[PDB]
């Protein structure tokens, strides 16, 4: 039983030698200097290089570093009896001291099924979320409050209703919205709920509110439990600013039992490099799903800072692969989103995704309501097998949006 880590290494020295050094150094330390009695005793703890794939040199990389660097994908097996069954131990074992060893990037981690079962996975997952929001087939639609810092509860409820009246399925706090005297955590939840229950009357549409769960680590459980008691819909959580283990703790507390939406804030300090860090499919995908995120927002493959397409798809696959013993987590590609991209979003990610209108929903000629209607019309059009312009010719809200941002081609 071992966790197999896959790394990308760049080095001017023999990679196999370095790899063997890692497998041994980060497990038992030494082997050839051990008596026979100790070798048999420590055998089960010995790490091993499972595979090495030569990638050939890159002149682009060589020029950058100013030297010839060999490249290779290295796989190392770390016996699970070597560490406790918790994420901090997993990270320290597979990428603790190793993260300091020059050019090494963690690409993936694979675990025996028995080890995976020691972790929770999402509590609700895609199926649970759809039931809680009451939308069973079409992809969901979410938006974000605009400029709420320094604003009051009257503004919050007002802006919340506008978005819900726009037909969005979920509205979340801006990740930088922290508790204040004007906007107390508990009050955002209770007033937000009452306000959304009003829109429920005016419009059968039921909208959820993902409230930001912030503050010090050891105060999180108490607040989350209170949120559950107050009937909060979803807890937005800046997991990377805390630790993966904290997300797991929130997921496993039966007194909370509220959906958790993981925000990508700070994940960029770890994922973008070609030579260092941890690949997004693992950092934002596999590990967050395993830890307990019901929703995972991640860099979309569209816009000014688009994540490489295959990377984005890799994240979504990790979140939804049904070969895993965990419920599926909702993939939410974020940033660079507009109604004209809905057709492409659905083609790339499928029906079980969430269209994140973000704060942009407010940039529609007719406010959030118009912005929400434009997105809902766009989603319906795609599912009905119709071109947006075709549907737009019958939907002004969508018409306005298309004229302002255009339509992205989905044909291959």
Positions touching Mg ion (CB under 5 A) are: 174-175
Q: Phi-psi bin for 256: left (phi > 0), alpha (psi -120 to 50), beta?
A: alpha
Q: How far is the CB of 29 from a copy of itself (least distance, A)?
A: 3
Nearer to a copy of itself, 119 or 382 (CB): 119
The two three-digit tokens of residue 208, written as one number: 């959820």
Binding status of residue 176 toward a copy of itself by CB under 8 A: yes
| Sheet of strand 140-144: strand arrangement | 330-334, 295-299, 260-262, 234-237, 208-212, 170-172, 140-144, 354-358
Closer of 98 and 391 to a copy of itself (Cβ):
98
Integer Cα distance of 71 and 50 in angstroms = 17
Q: Which of 50, 55, 92, 135 binds a copy of itself (CB under 8 A)?
A: 92
Closer to a copy of itself by Cβ: residue 178 or 200: 178
Question: To the nearest whole angstrom, how small is the minimum distance from the Cβ of residue 237 to a copy of itself?
Answer: 10
Choose between 48 and 198: whose C-beta lies nearer to a copy of itself: 48
Q: Is 116 a catalytic residue?
A: no
Residue 406 interacts with which of Mg ion, a copy of itself, none, CB < 5 to 8 Å by class: none
Which of 8, 15, 98, 357: binder of a copy of itself (CB under 8 A)? 98
Q: By CB under 8 A, name the one of 48, 55, 83, 228 that touches a copy of itself.
A: 83
202 contact choice in Mg ion, a copy of itself, none (CB below 5 to 8 Å, kind-dependent): none
> Of the two residues 270 and 327, which places its CB atom closer to a copy of itself in the complex?
270
Report the C-alpha dihedral over residues 94, 98, 100, 106, rounded to 10 degrees. Answer: -60
Question: Which CA distances in Å does 65 have to 98, 237, 279?
Answer: 20, 38, 21
Closer residue to Mg ion in complex, CB, 192/314: 192
Residue showing tokens 């030494």: 30
Q: How far is the CB of 147 from a copy of itself (least distance, A)?
A: 3
Backbone angles phi and psi of 223, in degrees to 5: -65, -45
Task: Determine if residue 364 is labeled as part of a ligand binding site.
Answer: no
Binding-residue pattern over the window 359 to 388 for a copy of itself, x denoting contact by CB under 8 A: x-----------------------------
Asked if residue 98 lies in contact with residue 108, where contact means CB atoms within 8 angstroms, the answer is no
Cβ contacts of residue 275 below 8 Å, gap of 6+?
A: 8, 10, 61, 103, 105
3-state helix, strand, coil in the chain (%, to 5): 45, 15, 35
Q: Which of 185, 125, 195, 146 is nearest to 372 (CA)?
A: 146
Annotated active-site residue in 18, 44, 75, 97: 97
Q: If binding is defined by CB under 8 A, does position 84 make contact with a copy of itself?
A: yes
Nearest to 316 by CA among 303, 298, 342, 334: 298
Query: Does 154 participate in binding a copy of itself (rule CB under 8 A)?
Result: no
List, in sequence order, every residue forming a beta bridge with 104; answer none if it has no partner.
9
* Residue 338 assigned ligand-binding role: no
179 binds, among Mg ion, a copy of itself, none (CB under 5 to 8 A by kind): a copy of itself
Query: Taking a C-beta distance cutoff of 8 angstroms, is the pair 268, 284 a contact?
Result: no
Residues 290-329 that bind a copy of itself (CB under 8 A): 299, 304-305
Q: What is the DSSP letter of 8?
A: E
**What binding mask, one character per residue, do residues 112-151 give for a copy of itself by CB under 8 A, x or -?**
----------------------------------xxxxxx
Which strand (E) or helix (H) includes residue 175? none
At residue 57, φ and ψ (nearest 5 deg) are -80, 155
Tell me how far, at minimum, the Cβ of 236 lies from Mg ion, in Å. 10
Instruction: Report, in Å, the least distance between residue 186 CB and Mg ion.
Output: 22
Q: Given candidates 215, 231, 325, 406, which one binds a copy of itself under the rule CB under 8 A?
A: 215
Annotated catalytic residues are: 97
Residues annotated within the binding site for substrate are: 146, 172-175, 263, 336, 358-359
């Amino acid at each position: 039983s071992a966790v197999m880590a896959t790394y990308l290494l760049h080095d001017e020295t023999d990679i196999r030698k370095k790899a063997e050094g890692i497998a041994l150094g980060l497990t038992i330390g030494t082997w050839t200097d051990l008596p026979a009695l100790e070798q048999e005793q420590l055998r089960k703890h010995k790490g091993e290089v499972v595979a090495i794939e030569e990638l050939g040199e890159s002149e682009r990389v060589n020029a950058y570093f100013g030297k010839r660097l060999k490249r290779a994908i290295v796989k190392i097996a770390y016996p699970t009896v070597n560490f406790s069954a918790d994420l901090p131990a997993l990270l320290v074992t597979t990428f603790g001291k190793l993260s300091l060893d020059g050019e090494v990037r963690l690409l993936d981690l694979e675990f025996p099924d028995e080890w995976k079962r020691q972790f929770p996975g999402p509590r609700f997952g895609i199926d649970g979320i759809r039931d809680r929001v009451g939308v069973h087939n079409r992809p969901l639609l979410m938006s974000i409050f605009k400029g709420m810092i320094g604003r009051d509860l009257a503004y919050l409820t007002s802006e919340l209703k506008k978005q819900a009246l726009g037909g969005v399925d979920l509205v979340k706090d801006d990740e930088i919205l922290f508790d204040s005297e004007l906007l107390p955590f508990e009050k955002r939840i209770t007033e937000g709920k009452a306000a959304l229950q009003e829109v429920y009357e005016q419009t059968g549409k039921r909208t959820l509110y993902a409230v930001n769960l912030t503050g010090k680590t050891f105060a999180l459980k108490d607040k989350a439990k209170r949120a559950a008691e107050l009937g909060a819909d979803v807890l937005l959580f800046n997991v990377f600013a805390y630790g993966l283990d904290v997300l797991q703790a929130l997921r496993e507390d039966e007194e909370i039992a509220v959906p958790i939406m993981a925000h990508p804030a700070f994940s960029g300090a770890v994922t973008p490099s070609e030579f260092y860090g941890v690949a997004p499919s693992l950092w934002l995908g596999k590990l967050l799903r395993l830890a307990g995120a019901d929703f995972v927002l991640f860099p979309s493959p569209y816009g000014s800072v688009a994540l490489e397409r295959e990377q984005a798809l890799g994240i979504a696959r990790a979140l939804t692969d049904d070969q895993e013993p965990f419920a599926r987590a909702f993939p939410v590609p974020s940033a660079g989103i507009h109604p004209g991209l809905v057709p492409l979003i659905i083609r790339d990610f499928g029906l079980d995704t969430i269209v994140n209108a973000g704060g942009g929903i407010h940039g529609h000629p007719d406010g959030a309501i118009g912005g929400g209607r434009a997105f809902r019309a766009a989603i319906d059009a795609v599912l009905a097998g119709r071109p947006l312009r075709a549907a737009a010719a019958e939907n002004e809200a969508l018409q306005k949006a298309i004229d302002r941002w255009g339509v992205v081609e989905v044909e291959a």
